[PDB]
Design an enzyme around this catalytic site. Structure first.
Site, PDB file in Angstrom:
ATOM      1  CG  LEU A  22      44.742  34.667  42.089  1.00 51.75           C
ATOM      2  CD1 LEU A  22      43.505  34.501  42.929  1.00 51.75           C
ATOM      3  CD2 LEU A  22      45.687  35.083  43.114  1.00 51.75           C
ATOM      4  CD  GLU A  30      38.945  34.482  48.326  1.00 54.23           C
ATOM      5  OE1 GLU A  30      39.368  35.122  49.059  1.00 54.23           O
ATOM      6  OE2 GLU A  30      39.652  34.938  47.016  1.00 54.23           O
TER       7      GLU A  30
HETATM    8  N1  LIG Z   1      46.303  35.971  46.437  1.00 55.87           N
HETATM    9  C1  LIG Z   1      46.177  37.211  46.644  1.00 55.87           C
HETATM   10  O1  LIG Z   1      45.650  37.688  47.569  1.00 55.87           O
HETATM   11  C2  LIG Z   1      47.155  38.086  45.707  1.00 55.87           C
HETATM   12  C3  LIG Z   1      47.810  37.537  44.807  1.00 55.87           C
HETATM   13  N2  LIG Z   1      48.588  38.474  43.971  1.00 55.87           N
HETATM   14  C4  LIG Z   1      49.398  37.800  42.831  1.00 55.87           C
HETATM   15  O2  LIG Z   1      50.951  38.120  43.360  1.00 55.87           O
HETATM   16  C5  LIG Z   1      51.549  38.271  42.138  1.00 55.87           C
HETATM   17  C6  LIG Z   1      51.931  39.921  41.925  1.00 55.87           C
HETATM   18  O3  LIG Z   1      52.612  40.322  43.233  1.00 55.87           O
HETATM   19  P1  LIG Z   1      54.089  40.755  43.404  1.00 55.87           P
HETATM   20  O4  LIG Z   1      54.798  39.866  42.393  1.00 55.87           O
HETATM   21  O5  LIG Z   1      54.523  40.770  44.627  1.00 55.87           O
HETATM   22  O6  LIG Z   1      54.035  42.033  42.733  1.00 55.87           O
HETATM   23  P2  LIG Z   1      53.563  43.642  43.172  1.00 55.87           P
HETATM   24  O7  LIG Z   1      52.111  43.700  42.818  1.00 55.87           O
HETATM   25  O8  LIG Z   1      53.844  43.994  44.454  1.00 55.87           O
HETATM   26  O9  LIG Z   1      54.504  44.482  41.997  1.00 55.87           O
HETATM   27  C7  LIG Z   1      55.918  44.718  42.236  1.00 55.87           C
HETATM   28  C8  LIG Z   1      56.171  46.134  41.543  1.00 55.87           C
HETATM   29  O10 LIG Z   1      55.320  47.141  42.010  1.00 55.87           O
HETATM   30  C9  LIG Z   1      56.157  48.317  42.537  1.00 55.87           C
HETATM   31  N3  LIG Z   1      56.167  48.416  43.830  1.00 55.87           N
HETATM   32  C10 LIG Z   1      55.736  47.383  44.811  1.00 55.87           C
HETATM   33  N4  LIG Z   1      55.777  47.950  45.949  1.00 55.87           N
HETATM   34  C11 LIG Z   1      55.926  49.439  46.035  1.00 55.87           C
HETATM   35  C12 LIG Z   1      56.109  50.506  46.821  1.00 55.87           C
HETATM   36  N5  LIG Z   1      55.981  50.265  48.006  1.00 55.87           N
HETATM   37  N6  LIG Z   1      56.457  51.664  46.280  1.00 55.87           N
HETATM   38  C13 LIG Z   1      56.753  51.992  44.743  1.00 55.87           C
HETATM   39  N7  LIG Z   1      56.530  50.739  43.956  1.00 55.87           N
HETATM   40  C14 LIG Z   1      56.270  49.590  44.623  1.00 55.87           C
HETATM   41  C15 LIG Z   1      57.166  47.931  41.737  1.00 55.87           C
HETATM   42  O11 LIG Z   1      57.200  48.415  40.500  1.00 55.87           O
HETATM   43  P3  LIG Z   1      58.360  49.300  39.749  1.00 55.87           P
HETATM   44  O12 LIG Z   1      59.654  48.631  39.312  1.00 55.87           O
HETATM   45  O13 LIG Z   1      57.742  50.098  38.559  1.00 55.87           O
HETATM   46  O14 LIG Z   1      58.825  50.661  40.670  1.00 55.87           O
HETATM   47  C16 LIG Z   1      57.457  46.472  41.690  1.00 55.87           C
HETATM   48  O15 LIG Z   1      58.354  46.008  40.582  1.00 55.87           O
HETATM   49  C17 LIG Z   1      50.796  38.005  41.022  1.00 55.87           C
HETATM   50  O16 LIG Z   1      51.132  36.487  40.842  1.00 55.87           O
HETATM   51  C18 LIG Z   1      49.393  38.105  41.676  1.00 55.87           C
HETATM   52  O17 LIG Z   1      48.331  37.225  40.861  1.00 55.87           O
HETATM   53  C19 LIG Z   1      48.953  39.715  44.188  1.00 55.87           C
HETATM   54  C20 LIG Z   1      48.051  40.233  45.226  1.00 55.87           C
HETATM   55  C21 LIG Z   1      47.330  39.338  46.020  1.00 55.87           C
HETATM   56  C1  LIG Z   2      44.818  41.235  44.398  1.00 57.04           C
HETATM   57  C2  LIG Z   2      44.212  40.134  45.503  1.00 57.04           C
HETATM   58  S1  LIG Z   2      43.833  40.623  47.029  1.00 57.04           S
HETATM   59  C3  LIG Z   2      42.794  39.230  47.239  1.00 57.04           C
HETATM   60  N1  LIG Z   2      42.164  38.883  48.246  1.00 57.04           N
HETATM   61  C4  LIG Z   2      41.276  37.915  48.293  1.00 57.04           C
HETATM   62  N2  LIG Z   2      40.749  37.413  49.572  1.00 57.04           N
HETATM   63  N3  LIG Z   2      41.295  37.024  47.078  1.00 57.04           N
HETATM   64  C5  LIG Z   2      42.072  37.563  46.049  1.00 57.04           C
HETATM   65  O1  LIG Z   2      41.861  36.808  44.848  1.00 57.04           O
HETATM   66  C6  LIG Z   2      42.723  38.436  46.014  1.00 57.04           C
HETATM   67  C7  LIG Z   2      43.528  39.187  44.910  1.00 57.04           C
HETATM   68  S2  LIG Z   2      43.750  38.537  43.036  1.00 57.04           S
HETATM   69  C8  LIG Z   2      42.244  39.213  42.384  1.00 57.04           C
HETATM   70  C9  LIG Z   2      42.243  39.174  41.198  1.00 57.04           C
HETATM   71  C10 LIG Z   2      41.266  39.473  40.251  1.00 57.04           C
HETATM   72  C11 LIG Z   2      40.163  40.139  41.192  1.00 57.04           C
HETATM   73  C12 LIG Z   2      39.135  40.810  40.274  1.00 57.04           C
HETATM   74  O2  LIG Z   2      38.778  40.665  39.017  1.00 57.04           O
HETATM   75  N4  LIG Z   2      37.974  41.478  40.897  1.00 57.04           N
HETATM   76  C13 LIG Z   2      36.695  42.101  40.269  1.00 57.04           C
HETATM   77  C14 LIG Z   2      35.698  40.967  40.029  1.00 57.04           C
HETATM   78  C15 LIG Z   2      35.148  40.257  41.183  1.00 57.04           C
HETATM   79  C16 LIG Z   2      34.380  39.073  40.694  1.00 57.04           C
HETATM   80  O3  LIG Z   2      34.784  38.371  40.082  1.00 57.04           O
HETATM   81  O4  LIG Z   2      33.183  39.359  41.491  1.00 57.04           O
HETATM   82  C17 LIG Z   2      36.177  43.133  41.318  1.00 57.04           C
HETATM   83  O5  LIG Z   2      36.635  43.048  42.320  1.00 57.04           O
HETATM   84  O6  LIG Z   2      35.387  43.918  40.989  1.00 57.04           O
HETATM   85  C18 LIG Z   2      40.185  40.368  42.258  1.00 57.04           C
HETATM   86  C19 LIG Z   2      41.377  39.830  43.031  1.00 57.04           C
END
Ligand SMILES: NC(=O)C1=CN([C@@H]2O[C@H](COP(=O)(O)OP(=O)(O)OC[C@H]3O[C@@H](n4cnc5c(N)ncnc54)[C@H](OP(=O)(O)O)[C@@H]3O)[C@@H](O)[C@H]2O)C=CC1
Ligand SMILES: Cc1sc2nc(N)[nH]c(=O)c2c1Sc1ccc(C(=O)N[C@@H](CCC(=O)O)C(=O)O)cc1
Length: 186
Positions: A22, A30
């Site tokens: 993150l 959160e």
């Molecule tokens: N703040 C938040 O709520 C969230 C934060 N994050 C953060 O975002 C980053 C990770 O996200 P991001 O970099 O976008 O990567 P993704 O989690 O989307 O991973 C990308 C890989 O997933 C596969 N992929 C993605 N979409 C598809 C699809 N529709 N079908 C098949 N395969 C798919 C691929 O793998 P392959 O090449 O093997 O096909 C692609 O290389 C991290 O920094 C994480 O901490 C992630 C989610 C939420």
């Molecule tokens: C992949 C996403 S979607 C998302 N949406 C909101 N609102 N906040 C986030 O931070 C994330 C994230 S990143 C993330 C990374 C780790 C975890 C995690 O370790 N969750 C555990 C532990 C939760 C806890 O710390 O209580 C679980 O859901 O059981 C959850 C989200």
């Protein structure tokens, strides 16, 4: 299968990730909100299904994988089988959502939660049908290398209340944030 939902926490500059984690330091409550929303099933004897990209899976601390009490599905075209600890692997979002209709999952799954990353959020959000976005607005800019796609507010209505979602400003680690729920149906 019940409702389809995305959940994300995003900075003011639309950041969601940096160097595989993150952009902001840990916000314990959160994360607890993420766990409560994604785990809590409206429906007796069912669990919710979490859909995520491969990098998002490996971004979750291994001690917390699979996300407990939820069915964990990873999206990847390169992987040949679910990663260690994961339950299912699909090659596309449409494939994942269809799996949920198969006899194995049909009566097991309540809500579906897409938990990122950017590509999966964008596809989900642009896909016709009934979809909610649970968005935590992290109220500062943070340096990021992965961003949330544009929310089109013509189609996504910000809901003026939602049961179980606090409406006031939160603060942890000196960082203010607020919870939002969007809903479209097209
Ligand atoms: N703040 C938040 O709520 C969230 C934060 N994050 C953060 O975002 C980053 C990770 O996200 P991001 O970099 O976008 O990567 P993704 O989690 O989307 O991973 C990308 C890989 O997933 C596969 N992929 C993605 N979409 C598809 C699809 N529709 N079908 C098949 N395969 C798919 C691929 O793998 P392959 O090449 O093997 O096909 C692609 O290389 C991290 O920094 C994480 O901490 C992630 C989610 C939420
Ligand atoms: C992949 C996403 S979607 C998302 N949406 C909101 N609102 N906040 C986030 O931070 C994330 C994230 S990143 C993330 C990374 C780790 C975890 C995690 O370790 N969750 C555990 C532990 C939760 C806890 O710390 O209580 C679980 O859901 O059981 C959850 C989200």
């Amino acid at each position: 299968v019940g409702s389809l939902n995305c959940i994300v926490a995003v900075s003011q500059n639309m950041g969601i990730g940096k160097n595989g984690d993150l952009p902001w330091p840990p916000l314990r409550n959160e994360f607890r909100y993420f766990k409560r929303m994604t785990t809590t099933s409206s429906v007796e004897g069912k669990q919710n299904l979490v859909i995520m990209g491969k990098k998002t899976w490996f971004s979750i601390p291994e001690k917390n994988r699979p996300l407990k009490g939820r069915i964990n599905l990873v999206l990847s075209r390169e992987l040949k089988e679910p990663p260690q600890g994961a339950h299912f692997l699909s090659r596309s979002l449409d494939d994942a959502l269809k799996l949920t209709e198969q006899p194995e999952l049909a009566n097991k799954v309540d809500m579906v939660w897409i938990v990122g990353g950017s590509s999966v959020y964008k596809e989900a959000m642009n896909h016709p049908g009934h979809l909610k976005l649970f968005v935590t607005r992290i109220m500062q800019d943070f340096e990021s290398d992965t961003f949330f796609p544009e929310i089109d507010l013509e189609k996504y209505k910000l809901l003026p209340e939602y049961p179980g979602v606090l409406s006031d400003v939160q603060e942890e680690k000196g960082i203010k944030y607020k919870f939002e729920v969007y809903e479209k149906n097209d």
